[PDB]
Amino acid sequence: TEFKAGSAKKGATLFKTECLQCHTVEKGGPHKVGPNLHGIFGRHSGQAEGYSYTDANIKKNVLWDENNMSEYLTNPKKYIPGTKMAFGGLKKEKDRNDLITYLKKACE
Ligand SMILES: O=S(=O)(O)c1cc2c(O)c(c1)Cc1cc(S(=O)(=O)O)cc(c1O)Cc1cc(S(=O)(=O)O)cc(c1O)Cc1cc(S(=O)(=O)O)cc(c1O)C2
Ligand code: HEC
């Protein structure tokens, strides 16, 4: 996939409805069902401090960027077979661009 910067405003609403139940974004924010996402961009998969990941999420062995994030969020278990993230994915390209535009700001 090829990320294109979109609307963080639309992305924020998508995060609220699709992601917030399992994830926080703020620095020092708590783990929930899923890990806190602060600092996710640039970091090795499966490496937030204090969170117990699947071996699949750890050993995916990629650094997160906007393009592999878009691919992941299209269909999480297809990109990371073995994942325990129970999210079906955002099939729509604009949704992923907007979400990721938001995530870049919100987890900085
Ligand atoms: O910046 S905005 O988010 O306000 C914006 C709103 C509209 C827009 O048409 C665009 C931006 C331009 C635009 C950008 C992109 S992107 O490169 O992926 O960022 C894609 C499109 C687009 O028109 C094409 C498009 C895709 C989809 S998808 O099926 O979800 O992938 C839906 C739409 C698209 O126009 C419809 C649409 C939704 C929305 S929504 O408010 O975000 O739901 C605003 C506008 C729309 O035309 C009206
Ligand atoms: C129902 C729960 C749930 C939902 C909904 C969910 N997630 Fe997750 N997410 C998780 C869990 C659990 C993990 C850890 C999975 C593992 O260890 O295999 C995870 C992992 C991730 C990771 C990898 C983190 C890392 O450090 O490698 C990212 C990125 C992520 N989620 C983003 C999102 C985004 C963005 C959304 C919404 C679009 C979302 N998630 C929706 C539960 C969820």
Side-chain angles (χ1 to χ4, degrees):
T1 177
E2 301 166 293
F3 166 81
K4 185 171 188 291
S7 168
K9 179 173 175 185
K10 176 64 188 295
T13 292
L14 285 164
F15 188 93
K16 182 185 77 182
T17 65
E18 307 302 309
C19 317
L20 177 60
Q21 196 151 7
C22 301
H23 292 282
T24 66
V25 295
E26 294 84 356
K27 182 177 181 177
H31 303 316
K32 308 205 299 180
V33 160
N36 169 268
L37 298 175
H38 178 78
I40 188 67
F41 290 104
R43 191 167 59 222
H44 193 288
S45 59
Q47 289 290 345
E49 190 169 359
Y51 185 84
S52 186
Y53 289 94
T54 61
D55 275 359
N57 197 333
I58 299 164
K59 298 174 185 290
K60 181 63 193 189
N61 295 346
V62 299
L63 307 181
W64 286 113
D65 61 56
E66 300 95 315
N67 304 312
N68 60 19
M69 187 68 66
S70 185
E71 180 174 346
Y72 181 54
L73 295 178
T74 305
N75 185 339
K77 73 188 193 70
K78 197 161 187 201
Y79 186 64
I80 309 187
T83 187
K84 282 193 153 55
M85 173 161 141
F87 180 68
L90 294 167
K91 306 310 182 186
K92 297 162 172 184
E93 191 81 8
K94 190 181 186 294
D95 281 353
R96 285 179 276 112
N97 284 334
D98 292 340
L99 188 288
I100 293 168
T101 303
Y102 162 83
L103 205 61
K104 288 169 70 167
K105 300 182 189 294
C107 66
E108 85 200 328

